[PDB]
Amino acid sequence: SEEIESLEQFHMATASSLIHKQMCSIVYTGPLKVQQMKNFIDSLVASLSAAVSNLVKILKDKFGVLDVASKRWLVKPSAKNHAWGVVETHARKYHVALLEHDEFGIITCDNWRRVAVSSESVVYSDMAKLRTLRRLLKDGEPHVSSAKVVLVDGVPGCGKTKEILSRVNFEEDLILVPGRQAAEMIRRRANASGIIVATKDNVRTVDSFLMNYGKGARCQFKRLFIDEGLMLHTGCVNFLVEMSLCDIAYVYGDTQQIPYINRVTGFPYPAHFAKLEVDEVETRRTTLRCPADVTHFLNQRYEGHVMCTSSEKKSVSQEMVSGAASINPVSKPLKGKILTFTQSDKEALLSRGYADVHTVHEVQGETYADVSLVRLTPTPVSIIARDSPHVLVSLSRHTKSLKYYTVVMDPLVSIIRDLERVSSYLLDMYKVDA
Amino acid sequence: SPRVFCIGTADTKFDELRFLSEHVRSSLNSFSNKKVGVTVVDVSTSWKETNSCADFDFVPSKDVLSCHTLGEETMGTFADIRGLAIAIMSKALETFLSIANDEQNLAGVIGLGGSGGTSLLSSAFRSLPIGIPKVIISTVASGQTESYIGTSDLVLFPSVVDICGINNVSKVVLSNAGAAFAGMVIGRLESKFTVGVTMFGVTTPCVNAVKERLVKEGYETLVFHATGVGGRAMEDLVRGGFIQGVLDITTTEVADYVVGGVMACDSSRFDAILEKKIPLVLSVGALDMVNFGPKTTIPPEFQQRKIHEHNEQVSLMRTTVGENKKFAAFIAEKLNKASSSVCVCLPEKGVSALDAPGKDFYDPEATSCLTRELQMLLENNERCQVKVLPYHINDAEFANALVDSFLEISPK
């Protein structure tokens, strides 16, 4: 559609014009929110500069390179139908090109000698976001909304999504969330009574909102709801608030969920930039889902004490499996929701005949009565650490029980053993009415 | 009726706890001439329950927890699940001992443990008044001990070997510690106006002159090295009732709290003194330096600041005009809350031996600002007098001018 046309400023621009070897000596000015927004834009300019520069590097000395003449790949890429890449002309000039495809691959031109693509150019999100955001500036200066912003600092199962689903007016408000799985979950839980009230217009991912701004749908919203806003750059949040034209915005955040990550070699994102500036701070410290033992765990990972309404106390247990093969639906059926930490293990369990299997990451925000967590990879698994957000999420999905089957000792095994050892009278101290 | 408590985690050290209690009871009866009761308290944090300890009056783990309710002291984060459990029990123990100390005769407390149990016991034990026997046979007595003892009279007896059963070694170590404790207990049962002063080597000329004056004026004195724990030590003694007046000459700890030095005070500095409403004469001694050491350690941002190398282990940083105003703000914000007489004495010439004419830290521009900033911030304080004297903090006349000011708000 007209999207590629909306990105004309990027089409055929020289690779050089988009590469900025610096963005480390940048000095920001104005109100804190303004610097955060500016910095957010810069983080995008920086990410794109790295993507374009890496493509040029590959051409001169995942990463796929196409030979225009033979229409055959010199180095096939992992992905397909890349949204863009860098073109190397016969004179050896480098340009950024918005890519078009057909039955035989990339539609090229006469002067094009080679084309380079990568995972970074699979989607043109940075360009899309940069296009949208710069259009909102008046000489590099972003407008700050006068809307009131309320931050709700919460913990697993305290009611972050629940409150949003309970307080939102679907005919007037907007709910923005970080990922597609979150959005689909929100829309699914809102529509669970039989009527579709949550659509693609009042519940969107942040990326979708930013990339298709103005493009249509609806612009003016009375109230904005952001679920899991600490997963976003502060400038991004200031932008969303302003772009939604809301009078008030409620940002629900969790300090121990996967946080916003730089991911750009020594890119400047100082501490005071990472702190969201808001008008009011509310705290939620009573988990309505988690058993007492998991609550104890939450107490050691969060600022402030965490209480629970649940009567459940001891709920976790583990099992070291001598033979990885023995983990099959016939030998040992896993009750409740079956989860794994990695995609590979997930595939393994599915290939063995286990039903409805997902990764911890794929079920964020979800609740289950019973959970069977499985680890089949004896080799090192990065995301399984005592301080990992994944471990946190994996321990807080169940209301009744959780059991961890693993082929090798790991931090989760220790955490679970520890929780099993805690005094029951101590666990009672976390109980609260309701 | 005097009572002592033998405390430990019975789920992992039951026999050692018993052996100790047995030896304490035996020693108490032995050393006295006259009856001291002994109660065994279990502070285990696991689910393993202990219902008794021989024939001793015994308090189970759950009973200690039941008198406590989660508070701010344990709301933060912790390294692991066990650390949190211990943190909560520790504070619960503190409540349990508070109760026993009010509506009962607490004669002393003793315990044993590794780093964990010691950490658990120390916190609750040091919450009791100085004088009351506090003893812990610890496996970590030899090493860094300040986080356990703090400013208290808590005594850590080295266990020598790891506490793991009664053997020829632990038998002797536990017997000695238990006898020592019993001695302190029986000995206690069967048996002037003091001024506190803050000091630094760079203000010792002032402090020594003030001390000689005070002793001559008939006072008893306690000098504290302003290293961060010093001010805290002084203040804990103030609420303990051991200090009736304070001459806070060296407030240098404020510089470190503000700038971020190594010998910093905490946000509570001065509160103890003001809450007691005891006479307070305060000054700006050594507020011209923030402590670091060694240079290689000096945080990156201050690496370009004016540094003075005292030793290989300590390097002093000269405070800037801008930082001095912040020092004044901290002091003033506290003093303006006073509900009793306070006098601020300021030496116009300099605040330390290094802040004098012809010395490495001399900067009358910073001194002047510190002075004018205190005056301004304290101008509407109807409880505080501000005196600006034409001297250097170490000049004999300044010292005697300090005691003069003290005498007027604390006549004798």
Ligand SMILES: Nc1ncnc2c1ncn2[C@@H]1O[C@H](COP(=O)(O)OP(=O)(O)OP(O)(O)=S)[C@@H](O)[C@H]1O
């Ligand atoms: N389908 C359901 N039926 C009954 N109770 C539910 C259901 N879904 C969620 N809950 C309860 O709602 C509470 C969780 O509210 P949520 O907002 O979904 O969790 P949260 O505060 O968002 O924390 P996260 O996102 O899971 S880390 C828990 O008490 C769940 O037991």
Ligand SMILES: Nc1ncnc2c1ncn2[C@@H]1O[C@H](COP(=O)(O)OP(=O)(O)OP(O)(O)=S)[C@@H](O)[C@H]1O
């Ligand atoms: N996971 C846990 N949860 C709750 N309590 C625990 C846990 N693990 C251990 N404890 C208890 O913590 C207390 C101290 O354990 P100890 O083995 O005695 O540690 P310690 O010898 O005093 O010091 P260190 O750190 O082991 S040298 C005992 O009551 C244990 O049962």
Ligand SMILES: [Cs+]
């Ligand atoms: Cs163009």
Ligand SMILES: [Cs+]
């Ligand atoms: Cs450029």
Ligand SMILES: [Cs+]
């Ligand atoms: Cs199942």
Ligand SMILES: [Cs+]
């Ligand atoms: Cs006797």
Ligand SMILES: [Cs+]
């Ligand atoms: Cs005797």
Ligand SMILES: [Cs+]
């Ligand atoms: Cs209680």
Ligand SMILES: [Cs+]
């Ligand atoms: Cs200092």
Ligand SMILES: [Cs+]
């Ligand atoms: Cs005054």
Ligand SMILES: [Mg+2]
């Ligand atoms: Mg949620």
Ligand SMILES: [Mg+2]
């Ligand atoms: Mg906490």
